[PDB]
Design a protein around this ligand. Structure first.
Ligand SMILES: COc1ccc(C(=O)Nc2ccc(Oc3ccc(N(C(=O)[C@H]4CC[C@H](C)CC4)C(C)C)c(C(=O)O)c3)cc2)cc1
Length: 105
């Protein structure tokens, strides 16, 4: 399974945008999984912090010139990586900053 019982609950509290109304749902995970297949990426990688980090490494070079679809996929996986990593986040913006802040020492 992509998310554990505890994970889904954290998942459901995270906002798509800072202070936004919309929050993450199972359908974003289902969409991200189909999307990965469309990008020739193994959707099983969604299941772990390490697999999600590998996917973001694969997608990031294309993120600067990316379409909304690619940017949305990337944002959803970053959030999932945080959830798998047990990094608390309130929204997608926070998730992206915390990942940026781990790497960037
Ligand atoms: C101020 O900082 C920020 C500003 C903006 C954002 C932000 O936009 N975050 C942000 C935007 C999109 C994100 O992920 C998705 C992926 C698929 C979606 N779906 C779609 O149908 C979309 C598929 C792609 C297509 C191109 C549009 C429809 C369905 C699964 C519901 C949706 C959605 O519409 O809820 C959202 C995650 C974060 C985050 C931070």
């Amino acid at each position: 399974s992509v998310l554990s019982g505890g994970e889904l609950d954290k998942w459901e509290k995270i906002r798509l945008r800072p202070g936004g109304k919309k929050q993450y749902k199972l359908k974003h995970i289902v969409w991200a999984s189909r999307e990965l297949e469309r990008f020739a990426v193994n959707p099983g990688l969604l299941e772990t912090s390490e697999g999600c980090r590998q996917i973001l490494g694969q997608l990031q070079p294309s993120l600067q010139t990316g379409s909304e679809e690619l940017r949305s996929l990337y944002n959803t996986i970053a959030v999932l990586y945080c959830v798998h990593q047990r990094i608390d986040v309130k929204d997608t913006k926070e998730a992206l900053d915390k990942i940026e802040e781990e790497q960037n020492k």
